[PDB]
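Tokens in:
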């Protein structure tokens, strides 16, 4: 009994249980909330099946401490390894498919704007110079400012990843373009006259604004004071009429007509320009971890060595640890890539922060656990902390919005 050790002078096993109990309660609360309000846009706009898998993994996480703190039975040694191994694999491998999907969607977004300016501004598959004599390639992508033609080729090879000999492809030109877009977005957000407009527009209309920036510069776009106010107040027709009067429309009519049309409709008309699959992939990544766990059951049969000490060796811990490490690594990779994505009330900003801490917690875990003389309790807290972070940073903010902000 955990109370006995508490009265003998050891408050560790009673603390881990209470932690786990509060964890299960919090996960039970959050889960019921999503069941009731499944039709509310904050829950509907995200993958709901994946969340249930993430919530289940967190639940099993807290249940682990009941297997590390238990009566000495044989199957509890089995439940430990199955629990400490599969629980992270259920949450993280479901989260990676979610982040990967967010990464592909974002990549396809950068694909559209790339095609937009390929049509409006043009493209060169070999090295040239701008109006100021600096070496340039693709859609106006500056390579270097040295007169050396060799200097531009060296910078190009570092950016592409091969020996290009001054010649690239459309895809490789898009690679360089993605940088220039991100650089342009930075400037807009650091511009007081362009930032409020950019924040209000949808995905398509933001590309149109960037298009204007790539033609006239930030100082130039800020000149459209009235038209920018119209776009911000979502008065598209008036903005269009207003923009058709500018010197910009009259100096470059063909291109300006396409940019304006994009503002009007919010579509790509002026330019020629799976849920089930996610569950299967998530299921596959979880089965791989199970295969590792089952194989280690055969190689090294679990056996009993309040505290329940099992004969689980280092390899029995390291192998499922490393695989979970890969899942976490892939999650953080795509999460960082989509950190600024504002979908679902900036949902992606919360996922990135979780993976930042998760990486730290799991990295710090290795020297702490393997260097500990209190492994069971250290495992209990590590698991619950890992499960608490994913629960507190990803779900609690959405639960708060759904209960406190019914008008948002
Ligand atoms: N060896 C080892 C090891 C080390 C650490 Cl630091 C955490 C865990 C862990 C994490 C989760 C878990 C489950 C859901 C979630 F969202 C986060 N973590 N469940 C069980 N064990 C295992
Ligand atoms: C809300 C608070 C609920 C959280 C925990 C309360 C239950 C704690 C159970 C510990 C009992 C251990 C024992 O019976 O030996
Ligand atoms: C109410 C909460 C109850 C928690 C009860 C579980 C505590 C004891 C389980 C671990 C053990 O076997 O010692
Ligand atoms: C959760 C249950 C999922 C898997 C449990 C299967 C474990 C069986 C592996 C065989 C163990 C052994 O050979 O000793
Ligand atoms: C940031 C992603 C998550 C963190 C990565 C996970 C770390 C697991 C990978 C390798 C751990 C190193 C191998 C274990 C060291 C064995 C120590 C020992 O038994 O003496």
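Residues out:
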């Amino acid at each position: 009994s955990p109370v006995q050790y508490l009265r003998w002078g050891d408050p560790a096993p009673i603390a881990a249980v209470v932690f786990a109990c509060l964890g299960l309660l919090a996960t039970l609360f959050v889960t019921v909330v999503f069941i009731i309000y499944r039709d509310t846009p904050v829950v509907k706009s995200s993958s709901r099946e994946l969340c249930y898998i993430i919530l289940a993994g967190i639940c099993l996480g807290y249940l682990c401490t009941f297997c590390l703190i238990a009566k000495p039975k044989q199957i509890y040694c089995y439940l430990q390894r199955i629990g400490i191994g599969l629980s992270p694999a259920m949450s993280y491998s479901a989260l990676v498919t979610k982040t990967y999907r967010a990464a592909r969607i974002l990549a396809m977004s950068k694909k559209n704007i790339f095609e937009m300016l390929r049509i409006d501004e043009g493209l060169r598959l070999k090295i040239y110079k701008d109006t100021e004599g600096y070496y340039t390639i693709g859609i106006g992508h500056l390579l270097t400012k040295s007169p050396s033609l060799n200097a531009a080729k060296s910078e190009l090879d570092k950016a592409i990843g091969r020996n290009t000999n001054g010649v690239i492809t459309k895809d490789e030109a898009e690679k360089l373009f993605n940088q220039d877009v991100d650089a342009a977005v930075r400037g807009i957000l650091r511009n007081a006259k362009l930032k409020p407009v950019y924040d209000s527009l949808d995905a398509v209309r933001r590309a149109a604004l960037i298009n204007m920036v790539f033609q006239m510069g930030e100082t130039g776009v800020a000149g459209f004071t009235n038209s920018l106010r119209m776009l911000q107040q979502k008065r598209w027709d008036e903005a269009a009429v207003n923009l058709a009067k500018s010197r910009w429309y009259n100096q470059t009519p063909n291109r300006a007509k396409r940019v304006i049309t994009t503002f009007r409709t919010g579509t790509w008309d002026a330019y020629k320009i799976s849920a089930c699959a996610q569950l299967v992939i998530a299921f596959i990544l979880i089965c791989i971890q199970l295969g590792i766990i089952v194989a280690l059951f055969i190689m090294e049969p679990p056996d009993i060595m309040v505290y329940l000490i099992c004969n689980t060796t280092n390899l029995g811990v390291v192998a499922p640890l490393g695989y979970n490490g890969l899942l976490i690594l892939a999650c953080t990779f795509y999460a960082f890539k989509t950190r600024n994505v504002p979908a679902n009330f900036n949902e992606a900003k919360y996922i990135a922060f979780t993976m930042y801490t998760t990486c730290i917690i799991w990295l710090a875990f290795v020297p702490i656990y393997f260097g500990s003389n209190y492994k069971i309790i250290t495992m209990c807290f590590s698991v619950s902390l890992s499960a608490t972070v994913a629960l507190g940073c990803m779900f609690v903010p959405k639960v708060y919005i759904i209960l406190a902000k019914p008008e948002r």
